Swiss-Prot record:
Residues 17-123 form the Bromo domain. Chromatin reader protein that recognizes and binds acetylated histones and plays a key role in transmission of epigenetic memory across cell divisions and transcription regulation. Remains associated with acetylated chromatin throughout the entire cell cycle and provides epigenetic memory for postmitotic G1 gene transcription by preserving acetylated chromatin status and maintaining high-order chromatin structure. During interphase, plays a key role in regulating the transcription of signal-inducible genes by associating with the P-TEFb complex and recruiting it to promoters. Changing N99A: Abolishes binding to acetylated histones. Interacts with p53/TP53; the interaction is direct. Interacts (via CTD region) with CDK9 and CCNT1, acting as an associated component of P-TEFb complex. Interacts with RELA (when acetylated at 'Lys-310'). Interacts (via NET domain) with NSD3, CHD4, BICRA and ATAD5. The interaction with BICRA bridges BRD4 to the GBAF complex. Interacts (via NET domain) with JMJD6 (via JmjC and N-terminal domains); the interaction is stronger in presence of ssRNA and recruits JMJD6 on distal enhancers. Interacts with NSD3. Interacts with NIPBL. (Microbial infection) Interacts with bovine papillomavirus type 1 regulatory protein E2. This interactions may serve for the tethering of viral genomes to host mitotic chromosomes allowing successful partitioning of the viral genome during cell division. This is Bromodomain-containing protein 4. Changing D104G: Found in a patient with a neurodevelopmental syndrome; uncertain significance.
Length: 127
């Protein structure tokens, strides 16, 4: 069995910014979700080998996880907040697309997503 290469977290020729909205996405959004009791399935790329999900990457073609997002934020990979927000939304959507409706992992994603939406609702104005 095999996993794909993980998503990109470093690219020296991608232009980058450090901004107050991106700072909020690390300090408030990522940190809030990371510490949650249901974060663990989402803290690293899905390991389809260890988890015995041989069809995962047959179904999910845009993988994303909070480990990747954390690295992107810490290594200032993004230009804007919308790129990062999109990564969170991709992660949640993948979970809902792959899993059977009602499963434990879906409930976990929903709990994280509720907090995500609450924090993004108060994304600060650009300075
Ligand atoms: C380090 O531990 C974990 C990491 C990731 C997941 C995990 C993450 N995400 C995002 C998922 O979508 C996901 C689905 C999983 C799973 O075990 N499933 C759903 C798919 N089926 S199946 C039969 O359709 O392949 C098996 C059960 S584990 C997991 C679960 C872990 O341990 C419980």
């Amino acid at each position: 069995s095999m996993n794909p290469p993980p998503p990109e977290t470093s690219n020296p020729n991608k232009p980058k910014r450090q901004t107050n909205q991106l700072q909020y996405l690390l300090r408030v959004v990522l940190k809030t979700l990371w510490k949650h009791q249901f974060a663990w399935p989402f803290q690293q790329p899905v390991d389809a080998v260890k988890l015995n999900l041989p069809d995962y990457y047959k179904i999910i073609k845009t993988p994303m996880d909070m480990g990747t997002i954390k690295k992107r934020l810490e290594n200032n990979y993004y230009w804007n907040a919308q790129e990062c927000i999109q990564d969170f939304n991709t992660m949640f959507t993948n979970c809902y697309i792959y899993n059977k409706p009602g499963d434990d992992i879906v409930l976990m994603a929903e709990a994280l997503e509720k907090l995500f939406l609450q924090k993004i609702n108060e994304l600060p104005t650009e300075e």
